[PDB]
Amino acid sequence: ASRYWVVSLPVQNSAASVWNRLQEQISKHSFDTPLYRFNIPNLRVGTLDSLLALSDDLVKSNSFVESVSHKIRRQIEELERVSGIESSSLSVDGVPVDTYLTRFVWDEAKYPTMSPLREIVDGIHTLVAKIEDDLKVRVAEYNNVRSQLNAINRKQSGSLAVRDLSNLVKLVTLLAVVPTSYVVPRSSKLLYEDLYTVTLFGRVADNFRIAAREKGFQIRDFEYSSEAQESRNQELEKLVHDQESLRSSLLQWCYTSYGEVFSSWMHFCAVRVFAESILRYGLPPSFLACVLAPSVKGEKKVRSILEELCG
Amino acid sequence: QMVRFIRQEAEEKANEISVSAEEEFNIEKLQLVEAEKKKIRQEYERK
């Protein structure tokens, strides 16, 4: 998927034409930059030591967000049936990417406490970790289903080395010798063709051994009753269908968890807005930056505008 | 041709089993006909 791409600028360091022009009427419209934002400050902010601790923990928060993003982009997509949750279905904080990135409403009481965010950030991180753990549980279930997939049906289709009971003829044994007269009633022909059958009888072992493995190429043994092979094939088909359903229904829940993780990442970006505001401005949360996924030219223009607060 | 030989084999097995049973039958009969001179020393000699 896409990693974090939010800009860093406090309320006092807006890069637009005006301080309040970051949301709209900025020069970014001329350059077609998709940047958009909306303020959503917390109830209160911590002290300078609390701000430094939050800045230190922001690295761990970003690492957790990256882990959640990698899990969502890998586990769902690899199943080839879980990527059906679009941006609207995976809307962050209930709003699509068009509106989720244009506001910080995820700072409401769902993941944080709408309060001093020094511990609310850690609580939201723990909630996102729980969501990622649920996604990992879904991925493990998908892996176990895939283990149920590629079942006994993966063997040969009968009259061969493996799963040859499905092509059995059901004193005689399953031989299916692929490329005789005696006292025994060797005048017989089994139905062991997926292969060929040969004259054999159990009354005298000479004809049976001659037909089975005595000369030429030795035949391959198989289960006498084809009912067991049919049951195994049916179980394999059922397991494959269950794995496909899990990749389509259980992995649909995984995609829903991925949308929840996107909401958690939106909340993390909302928290990081206040973190940057504290880092490069006063303690109270107030930011005028923007979050989007622009082109190289738009980012360069934004950096040229904001060079007054360059890194 | 060995289909009839299966009947012969079964008859031979049954004959062997019957011969063993008859051979043990004499011993079983003698187990009661004989040694009762000892058991009568407890069943009635006690009286």
For CA atoms A132, A138, A141, A146, the dihedral sign is negative
Asked if A90 and A259 touch (Cβ cutoff 8 Å), the reply is: yes
CB-facing half-sphere around the CA of A293: CA atoms within 13 A:
8
Q: What is the resolution of this structure in A?
A: 4.0
Q: What is the DSSP string of A109-165?
A: TTSS-SS-HHHHHHHHHHHHHHHHHHHHHHHHHHHHHHHHSS-GGGS-SSSSSSSGG
User: For residue B7, what is the nearest residue in chain A, using CA coordinates?
Assistant: A203
Q: Report phi then psi at A36, rounded to 5.
A: -155, 150
Residue A56 region by backbone torsions, left for phi larger than 0, else alpha for psi between -120 and 50, else beta: alpha
Count of Cβ atoms closer than 10 Å to residue A297 Cβ: 11
Q: How far is CA A254 from CA A1, A87, A281, in A?
A: 15, 15, 39
- The answer to whether B1 contacts chain A (CB < 8 Å) is yes
CA separation for the pair A105, A91 (Å, rounded): 13
Q: What share of chain A is helix, strand, coil (3-state, %, to 5)?
A: 55, 0, 45
Partner-chain contact A183 B3, CB within 8 Å: no
Asked if A255 and A84 touch (Cβ cutoff 8 Å), the reply is: yes
CA separation for the pair A136, A142 (Å, rounded): 10
Q: Report phi then psi at A92, rounded to 5.
A: -80, 125
User: For residue A187, what is the nearest residue in chain B, using CA coordinates?
Assistant: B1
Nearest CA to A100 out of A261, A276, A296 is that of A261
User: What is the helix (H) or strand (E) element at residue A77, kind and residue range?
Assistant: helix A48-78
Method: cryo-EM
Nearest CA to A28 out of A227, A305, A231, A272 is that of A305
Nearest CA to A72 out of A232, A249, A203, A254 is that of A254
Q: Report phi then psi at A173, rounded to 5.
A: -135, 155
CA separation for the pair A292, A62 (Å, rounded): 17
Asked if A131 and A264 touch (Cβ cutoff 8 Å), the reply is: yes
In angstroms, what separates the C-alpha of A167 from chain B's closest C-alpha?
28
* CA trace torsion A46, A48, A53, A56 (10° rounding): 120
Q: Which residues contact A14 (CB under 8 A, 6 or more apart)?
A: A20, A21, A22, A288, A289
Partner-chain contact A204 B2, CB within 8 Å: yes
Count of Cβ atoms closer than 10 Å to residue A154 Cβ: 11
Helix axes A251-280, A48-78, angle to 10 degrees: 150
CA separation for the pair B26, A129 (Å, rounded): 88
Nearest CA to A274 out of A68, A120, A88, A71 is that of A120
Count of Cβ atoms closer than 10 Å to residue A148 Cβ: 17
CA separation for the pair A57, A131 (Å, rounded): 19
User: For residue B9, what is the nearest residue in chain A, using CA coordinates?
Assistant: A203
Q: Which residue has the tokens 């990417």?
A: A97
In angstroms, what separates the C-alpha of A200 from chain B's closest C-alpha?
13
In angstroms, what separates the C-alpha of A183 from chain B's closest C-alpha?
5
* CA trace torsion A225, A228, A229, A234 (10° rounding): 150
Asked if A143 and A247 touch (Cβ cutoff 8 Å), the reply is: no
Burial A56-69 (b: 16+ CB within 10 A, else e): ebbeebeebbeebb
